[PDB]
Amino acid sequence: GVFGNNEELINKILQSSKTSNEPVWWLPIINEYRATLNSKYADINQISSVK
Amino acid sequence: SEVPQVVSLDPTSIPIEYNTPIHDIKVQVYDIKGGCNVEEGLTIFLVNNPGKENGPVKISSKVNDKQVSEFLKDENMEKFNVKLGTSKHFYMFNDNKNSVAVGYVGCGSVADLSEADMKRVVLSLVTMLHDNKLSKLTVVFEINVDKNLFRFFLETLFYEYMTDERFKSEYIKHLGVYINNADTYKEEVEKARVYYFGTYYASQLIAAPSNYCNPVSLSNAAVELAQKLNLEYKILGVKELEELKMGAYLSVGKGSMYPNKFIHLTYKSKGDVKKKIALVGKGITFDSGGYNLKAAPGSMIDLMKFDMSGCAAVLGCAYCVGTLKPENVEIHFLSAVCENMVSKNSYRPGDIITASNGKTIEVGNTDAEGRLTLADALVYAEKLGVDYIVDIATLTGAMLYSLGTSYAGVFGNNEELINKILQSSKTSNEPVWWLPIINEYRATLNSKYADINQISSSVKASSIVASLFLKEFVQNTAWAHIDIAGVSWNFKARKPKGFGVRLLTEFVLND
Amino acid sequence: SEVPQVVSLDPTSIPIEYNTPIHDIKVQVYDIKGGCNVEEGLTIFLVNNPGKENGPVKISSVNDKVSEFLKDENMEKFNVKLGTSKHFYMFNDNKNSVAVGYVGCGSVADLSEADMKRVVLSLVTMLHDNKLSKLTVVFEINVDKNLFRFFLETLFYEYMTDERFKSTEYIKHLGVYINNADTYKEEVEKARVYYFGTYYASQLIAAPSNYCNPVSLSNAAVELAQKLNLEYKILGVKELEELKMGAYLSVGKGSMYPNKFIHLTYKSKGDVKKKIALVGKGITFDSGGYNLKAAPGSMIDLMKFDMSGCAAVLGCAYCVGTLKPENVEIHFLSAVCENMVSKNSYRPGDIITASNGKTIEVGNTDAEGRLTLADALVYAEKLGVDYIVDIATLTGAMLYSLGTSYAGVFGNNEELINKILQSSKTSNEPVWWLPIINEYRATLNSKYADINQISSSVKASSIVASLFLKEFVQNTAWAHIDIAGVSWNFKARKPKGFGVRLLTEFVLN
Amino acid sequence: ASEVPQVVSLDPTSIPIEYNTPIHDIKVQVYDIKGGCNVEEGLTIFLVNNPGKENGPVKISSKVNDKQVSEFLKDENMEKFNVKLGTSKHFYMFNDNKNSVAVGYVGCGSVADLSEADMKRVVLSLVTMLHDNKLSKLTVVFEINVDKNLFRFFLETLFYEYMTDERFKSTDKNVEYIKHLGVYINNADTYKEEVEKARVYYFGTYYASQLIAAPSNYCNPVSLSNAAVELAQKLNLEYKILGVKELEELKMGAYLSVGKGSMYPNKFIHLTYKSKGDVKKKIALVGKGITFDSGGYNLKAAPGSMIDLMKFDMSGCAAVLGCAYCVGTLKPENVEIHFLSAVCENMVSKNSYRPGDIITASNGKTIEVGNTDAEGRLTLADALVYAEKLGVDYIVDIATLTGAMLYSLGTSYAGVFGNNEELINKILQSSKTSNEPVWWLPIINEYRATLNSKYADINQISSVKASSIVASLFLKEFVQNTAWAHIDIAGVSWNFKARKPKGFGVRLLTEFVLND
Lengths: 51, 511, 509, 516
Ligand SMILES: CC(C)C[C@@H](C(=O)N[C@H](C(=O)O)c1ccccc1)[C@H](O)C(=O)NO
Ligand SMILES: CC(C)C[C@@H](C(=O)N[C@H](C(=O)O)c1ccccc1)[C@H](O)C(=O)NO
Ligand SMILES: [Zn+2]
Ligand SMILES: [Zn+2]
Ligand SMILES: [Zn+2]
Ligand SMILES: [Zn+2]
Ligand SMILES: [Zn+2]
Ligand SMILES: [Zn+2]
Prior knowledge:
The structure is cut from a larger assembly and holds four copies of chain A.
Chain A: H1 7-20
Bound molecules: the ligand CC(C)C[C@@H](C(=O)N[C@H](C(=O)O)c1ccccc1)[C@H](O)C(=O)NO (2 copies) and zinc ion (ZN) (6 copies).
One zinc ion is lined by residues 290, 293, 313, 375-376 of chain D.
């Protein structure tokens, strides 16, 4: 699986995947799940409590 | 058909609300460039603050009321911030000594609002309404929304505002909207109200417990829906299902006290037909798992009336299509409805059953019941001679591990159809992500004795494997499969989402 | 009334022993001051020793010169460790062979509920391996009038052996030497009655579920009512439909046995200054339903025990019907059914309607007891009674809370709680008061129904369940006795018949 | 003051503590309702109910010394709103001086006597009005009846929830605490004494909360004992911290074994308060101080285990130090109090103690370990032996001991066990006046036999699921002839929904020390 913050880079990853013949699939970074990392005390949680 | 009972106190029909209080709301849209009137009711400003995170609230719209303008001055509003979803509202008297409420909902610091961002904004509004007895709500959009997102706003507002009290023992009458380019958005209002009910209608079917919503009662409700819309309808019973040789579907329901019922609605255009579309929905009114009983920690068996969400999504689409009445199109709404139960009459792990296309199938897990019924529905669908077959189903719990509770996955054998669905996901704002059918896993379905395995032994990646199974029952037609298992139920709100209704409708309307 | 069968070899009734060898035992009680004589059988001295580790035994009295065996020098070789025992056989003055011995009662002077039980098991052990015709017991320790009765009751119960289901002896006389004997004599026949009431309950609980089903159990209740002389009424499905008991009826939907609501009634010849309803959970087998008991620890092979509340209720009916109390009206209630897996069963998620109109969302088909108890409490309150006491094996959490010795009681009225606690003291069946915390009520707020059956969370399972039941009592003092932890004796692999003596002491006081 | 060991230099060497909180900067003024209410600057809130009528209409019943604000609050206008418990509404209006003021209410239901949970629900609603609003002044008007204790409880709880812990934030923080608090109530002069008593109890509670919320890399045996020393110094309390060598001398084999696997040396905390008066009662308070409970070789690996929460296993100690603050501040008369905690960390190592190991307590009793995750009773055992040698009238210990508390009493009520009815009844009474709910649970002697070890004097655990009772039976064996009580707060210490500690026990223990 490939995740990213930039479509140009991701597609380059996909393009390299095609020519290297090492298969990779694009998966989404879903911002709605970001709130599950809101820690009560630290700046951020390491993990969710959203499987 | 007569719904069988064990005792006389067992319900014989699903209660359905057709006339909702939402249908009583007169909606008016005004242009923002002209300023706001704040006479009656509750007035809410949707405000953001670009580049300053949790920044101060600043209203920037002239209001034709001196008492409310003093309230909305910057010195007073800077006492609030725009953190997404945050809200404040005050009750006060305006210039003519009438009681009004004014407030805001924070829309963050990001110009571009998402499908999720808009949902949290809407919930904040809804929280104020569930505490409000007033007759009018006015919403002022000091943010950017396209025509689609504005419709999504109304749909979501409508959906959340409505409360289901069928099993229990002061709604607004007017909705005002100030938005830029108002006249372009007016056409979205009544389209939203339709999309609203289709989703809520599906919601009612899903939320209905399995003693209320069973194969017979759901098929009866489908007929009743068809009669109110005027759609051709046909319910296939066991005897006909036996002569169509639908052994996979029929096996699944053997252990139920309720006869199998196959739902077939049809919309036909008065036009000439340039597209035939079949929509297929998973219709398991309760998934106990059968002899593969759902007893493992996490199985969520208390939630398993929801396993007919796909079917509900299809009926929800049927309402919208039957109401909006698109042209040049013929739509078949299909669902092989049954109940997956434990009994002496139940089918067993290891049983080899024969689908209606002649393929023999070895059952390895009776809780993989959905793909077995869908198999027969897909064979039924393709013989209809359609251009597109789209199935939607709460098929695999694995989706929770892959895409989660917000995005559904779409699989298919045809890239154009997949692309059309993604486009439909993008204009309906019901998020879908394209997932692969990896052909290399196909060998894991090779049975030693039967034509094909029902499940793999091996290859965790069950969502793909389930799609590989389904692909075997569509021979020569463009087909797509949407797993809504992760997204169907709203776990936080303890209610259904009615997911898929708007997605499928946008697919038939914009194609 | 006819028990349905799958095959002809299936039992159509519960076998019941009414006339036990215990009812055949001659009991007489003497004052220790007159001395003891050791004619026939086995004579046992109950002795303690304040300042023991445990310390040596010392006897004190015997009108037969054998006084010498029990001399201080020989007896000092044995110790008084609670439960320790030794008995020796000898020839007496009349050249007859007699057996003499001791049971150690520790050093704590006033013996408790548990400790006295340990004494009895030790006594019973000697009786089970010996062919005695008479047993004589000497109390060289001090006990209450109530604890003595408890001694007798427990003795009788542990001594009795259930052989109903076997394919492949008892003493006829019991002697007791104690001081102020004339004060204890009234306790003897009361004990034998409490014995059978307890043993009767034990018989019902121990009866396997193929023998003890909703029909066969309701039949036994009628037979009990008939011999006793108690007014009886048995509700079948058609009158339960009437009455709209949807919660109770859903639980039994998956069973091959029709639901039967048991209603026995006792009315005093006195004038009635108290009307009491006793309600018992009567699940003849708890499979758990679609929430099948498949998890480790569920003990599904024991779930015939899930009608212990019902059994306790009928056992109480025996004592009440026999002892015939004054100024009391008692209703013996149990909504009996079976929780099974079937095409006809109720499902997780189902919304059902109780007889008071409240809609209930089922979250776990294994939370079946509170569903049946809900309708029973509505029915109970409709009789227009002053006190409602329900007793049920409701929650396994009780094992984590109080364990296997003390039962928990919950309630809405402190006086009723006070009477139950007082009854626990004189009945010597240990009970502890637990709180109904209203702060947890919100966990039952359903999205669709009037109320949730269970919490989704809130591991305070016993308290949440008590909260559930309380919603079905509007204006009556009600207490709830949870015997899920105390009903079964795991070590001895038999029932305790817990609650029979507790409930009876409650109506008597 | 000892040196906190580090594995890397980035390891924290002290627990951050906020002593001077924005709450302490708040000027609190109390007025009598009979003089009327002035509707100021800031936000003015009415606490209203409607006795015997459920979700009934709102009616203000206190003279407002403003014609414009009286007119707005006339009930013609107010009955469109209801008093449903937790409900709240905001009002905007202009007063007699043509100034803009804010007014509102919080519904207090229909039950007249508000329980502690109800009042919390009232307070939580108040805090929502305080959050996201930049008020400079908050005014509360009591149109409901509360006794002196419940009024104090109102303040304590208000302060607690209003306060936000930002010690461990760096790149996350945003907007502003009120500086003034006005209270309108009838018979105000009787309630004035509760104000500063609340401010103290609040912080003792928040102080305990801060220690518990502190993660185990911050809050360890050394850093926690350091914080206790530092606290004693600010309060002029006598302190002594026992290290490994003294604990060895004192032969505390049970306590010392538990800490063998930790990189942090064991630290025993002993604070003391003595009145200049003559001492007429001596009390020992013992708190469980496991800075992290991994479970040891009985590792917490089962699904319900809550291993990320186990920094909270020193809540008992935290309540005790929190009590020390309150006592050290209020300075009670004729009393001598010992604040004790055997602090350590239960870890997995080559040096860890093993399941099956037999250890010797300071009173000579040999103990067979059956489960290393039952480490708390081992530390309390030596702490209780230490406590009794001090020659006190009462020994009260408080601990997150058994998860069974969640199955028995839940998350709201703590359990108390004991060997003396008069002590149990003083603790229960303290629960009433502190409004920290506690319920009396039994120590069942029939269960003592399962602690009968084949080789050691006694087993650490049974092999009988009544864990809280068995643990109490264990502890009872380490108090010979002194009145003793055990408070199991395992279920009530952490607020799961809020995702924070409660600081449970501070007010209960403090009230217990004060009312004799
Ligand atoms: C299903 C209900 C919760 C009742 C159930 C019960 O308590 N089940 C649980 C289990 O043993 O798995 C459990 C035990 C202790 C603590 C928490 C949960 C009881 O056995 C019953 O079926 N009564 O009808
Ligand atoms: C097991 C111990 C004797 C005490 C321990 C405990 O009670 N654990 C729970 C229990 O026994 O109910 C639990 C165990 C496994 C899985 C889930 C929950 C407590 O957490 C602790 O370690 N205190 O120090
Ligand atoms: Zn399934
Ligand atoms: Zn399914
Ligand atoms: Zn059950
Ligand atoms: Zn049960
Ligand atoms: Zn532990
Ligand atoms: Zn611990």
